[PDB]
Design a protein around this ligand. Structure first.
Ligand SMILES: [Cl-]
Ligand SMILES: [Rb+]
Ligand SMILES: [Rb+]
Lengths: 123, 129
């Protein structure tokens, strides 16, 4: 069972928040709302559906941070002409994953930017 | 010197194309334009200036991004093994175009900033040999 301010779904407790935070601050904030707290993660289609529905019922049209950060930073970026990647001119340094309260599709946004979010903890 | 149509800058030849293609068709197209041809690579501020200048004067009225040769090599939607809670990443539900693993310049930032964009987009570009 979950705290009255959280919503349960298959042995997990979820709670959306309104105060916009960049990805890092949101995640950290989550860890401070209950033991073992973190940004929500999706292991199934039904779970994500439940979270979307909740976010919408809670705040309506909006966007919320998901527990995935620096998603392409560990990928292998390289010049097709095989030149050493040295000079950098990135508009953004890292991207993070979020979803909008209307559907369960994964979208991308710069991690330094802000968004609402959903926190989660087990059992 | 560089062939008629191409412009020179410290040992290389460049040519802009106001042609709309995906990153792959662009890169392949560039390889066909010159021996050793590829999508433009930017390895210095001076070179970045030279490219921005070329784009500014030759690729206009397209309202799009401009392809550069920097991108993630594979076809993955991402390179992340686990969520912030430590659990492993299996289930995924990306909107094809939300996975931006290719870079392109834009007018807004004076064609001097690399923007993460969907490789399936059909934008103009610049080749370099
Ligand atoms: Cl890769
Ligand atoms: Rb020339
Ligand atoms: Rb994938």
């Amino acid at each position: 069972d979950c705290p009255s301010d959280w919503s349960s779904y298959e042995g997990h407790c979820y709670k959306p928040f309104s105060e916009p935070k960049n990805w890092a601050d949101a995640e950290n904030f989550c860890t401070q709302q209950h033991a073992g707290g973190h940004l929500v993660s999706f292991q199934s289609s039904e779970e994500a559906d439940f979270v979307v529905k909740l976010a919408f019922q809670t705040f309506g049209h909006s966007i919320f941070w998901m527990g995935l950060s620096n998603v392409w930073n560990q990928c292998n970026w390289q010049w097709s002409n095989a030149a050493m990647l040295r000079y950098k001119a990135w508009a953004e340094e890292s991207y993070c994953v979020y979803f909008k309260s209307t559907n369960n599709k994964w979208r991308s946004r710069a991690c330094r930017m802000m968004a609402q979010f959903v926190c989660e903890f087990q059992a | 010197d560089c062939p008629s149509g191409w412009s020179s800058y410290e040992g290389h030849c460049y040519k802009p194309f106001k042609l709309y293609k995906t990153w792959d068709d662009a890169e392949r197209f560039c390889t066909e334009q010159a021996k050793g041809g590829h999508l433009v690579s930017i390895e210095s501020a001076g070179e970045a200036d030279f490219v921005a200048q070329l784009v500014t004067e030759n690729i206009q009225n397209t309202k799009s991004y401009v392809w550069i040769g920097l991108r993630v090599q594979g076809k993955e939607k991402q390179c992340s093994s686990e969520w912030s809670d430590g659990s492993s990443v299996s289930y995924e539900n990306w909107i094809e175009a939300e996975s931006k693993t290719c870079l392109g310049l834009e007018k807004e930032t004076g064609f001097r900033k690399w923007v993460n964009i969907y490789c399936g987009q059909q934008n103009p570009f610049v080749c370099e040999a």
